[PDB]
Amino acid sequence: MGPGFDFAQAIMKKNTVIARTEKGEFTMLGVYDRVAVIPTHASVGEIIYINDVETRVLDACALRDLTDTNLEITIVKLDRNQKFRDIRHFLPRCEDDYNDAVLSVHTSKFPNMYIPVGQVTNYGFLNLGGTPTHRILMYNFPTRAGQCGGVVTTTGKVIGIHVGGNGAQGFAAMLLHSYFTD
Numbered sequence: 001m002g003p004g005f006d007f008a009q010a011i012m013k014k015n016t017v018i019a020r021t022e023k024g025e026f027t028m029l030g031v032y033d034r035v036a037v038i039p040t041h042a043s044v045g046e047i048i049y050i051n052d053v054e055t056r057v058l059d060a061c062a063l064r065d066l067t068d069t070n071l072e073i074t075i076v077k078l079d080r081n082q083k084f085r086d087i088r089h090f091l092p093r094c095e096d097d098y099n100d101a102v103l104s105v106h107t108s109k110f111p112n113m114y115i116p117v118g119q120v121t122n123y124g125f126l127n128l129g130g131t132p133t134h135r136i137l138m139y140n141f142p143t144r145a146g147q148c149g150g151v152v153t154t155t156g157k158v159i160g161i162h163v164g165g166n167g168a169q170g171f172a173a174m175l176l177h178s179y180f181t182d
Helices: 003-015
Strands: 016-021 024-032 035-039 047-050 053-064 070-078 098-105 113-128 131-140 151-154 157-165 169-174
Touching: 003 016, 003 024, 003 098, 003 113, 003 151, 016 035, 024 157, 035 157, 047 070, 070 169, 098 131, 098 157, 113 151, 113 157, 113 169, 131 157
Parallel strands: 070 131
Antiparallel strands: 016 024, 016 047, 024 035, 035 070, 047 053, 053 070, 098 113, 098 151, 113 131, 131 169, 151 157, 157 169
């Protein structure tokens, strides 16, 4: 509808796949080469379904900060025959607050979904499902029964992936450029 939705659509149309684990269907962001991200609560194993195709997982790393605190991001390298468009130059370098963000989801249940979530706070610490978690972004969100990830963008920046909510607020794990240095 406007330039924020334009940037979000451009990311969804080229840099997402539908990932299925034993814990459900998730929006999965492809970042570069065969490397993608997903919430750690997806519990990625040795095999994952990517757009309903059986795919070997070459590597999966549940990220933690240097205090050994959960970040809720898993980085997956997929045994896929095709590379993602490289979007690392759209990743922020530092922890920050944002205005006017969009949360975008693409699953069998929620195809082509875009939500203007407004202001995003650098919230920091969250007890997420009983797990102490750092680097959380927050945006007011009439919390919806179900987590299938999500992509949080502003114009020109891919800033996070949706990992949870409390009924009124939604929460995303930050994406930082430093996670994807090769």
